[PDB]
Ligand SMILES: O=C(O)CC(=O)N[C@@H](CS)Cc1ccccc1
Ligand SMILES: [Ca+2]
């Protein structure tokens with residue numbers, strides 16, 4: 500779309516009012532020219548054919564219920580682009596300002612969201628298990644981070660490396676939730692999961708076990724479903740990351756917390772410089788240790804909390 504950059508206003512999935520970056524050319528489109536090669540949001544119109552139509556609105560006001568999910572996918576991808584740029588000096592997912600695209604209203608009552616190797620896709624949920632998935636900033640950033648991983652370490656989506664891939668996405672979506680200061684926590688998908696039940700979430704980083712996920716390597720899932728438990732075993736790494744940041748005693752192993760920022764800096768560095776497609780949990784530990792050493796010194800407290808955290812979850 501070639502046209503004039505402007506700013507529209509809308510209401511998100513959660514009923515919150517926000518300004519969004521649009522483009523004007525007869526209609527107002529969901530195309531933000533202010534970030535890299537642009538952020539583009541599409542209408543999949545309850546179908547599965549992608550991407551669908553670039554989103555067009557006649558008056559630059561996005562207050563209809565059908566508008567909600569596009570408003571949030573659009574604004575949240577903006578915030579995520581900004582977090583990567585500002586905090587890690589990464590320009591978009593490929594580091595070269597690749598255009599970011601998302602499709603909303605994908606299929607009918609689709610209870611998921613995913614990065615497909617080329618764009619982000621969000622279901623509207625069935626209204627009970629989930630509300631439209633783009634209404635959660637941790638979900639949006641989890642997605643975008645899979646793009647980041649794809650262009651860097653390239654972690655294969657199965658077994659150990661796949662759980663690492665899932666963990667990285669969970670870690671960075673929570674760091675983005677904190678960055679935006681959007682009621683942050685160490686829970687995943689809380690904003691959009693089971694609209695009728697308060698207080699739950701899909702996964703927990705603080706206590707993976709609360710939902711049945713392992714919090715220790717000895718409790719790892721060895722099976723076959725979920726690509727070998729990519730969404731299951733990610734709980735062992737999530738808990739490790741939560742401890743480095745926040746600290747605590749887990750299974751009798753004490754970890755002093757080094758905080759969020761440092762957590763993000765060590766993870767980012769591990770991801771972009773030391774992890775490979777086939778990296779396992781033990782290699783992630785070596786990666787994290789080496790990053791923290793690069794950054795803070797071998798004898799640092801930082802290096803100390805990273806070894807403790809992994810020893811707490813039985814990795815190493
Ligand atoms: O695929 C799954 O089992 C759920 C899942 O984690 N899906 C991911 C896509 S890998 C999207 C998501 C993330 C956070 C919260 C909700 C939805
Ligand atoms: Ca309108």
Ligand SMILES: [Ca+2]
Nearest residue numbers: 681682683684
């Ligand atoms: Ca939250």
Ligand SMILES: [Ca+2]
Nearest residue numbers: 637686687688
């Ligand atoms: Ca959260």
Ligand SMILES: [Ca+2]
Nearest residue numbers: 692693694696
């Ligand atoms: Ca809920």
Ligand SMILES: [Zn+2]
Nearest residue numbers: 641645665668
């Ligand atoms: Zn994922």
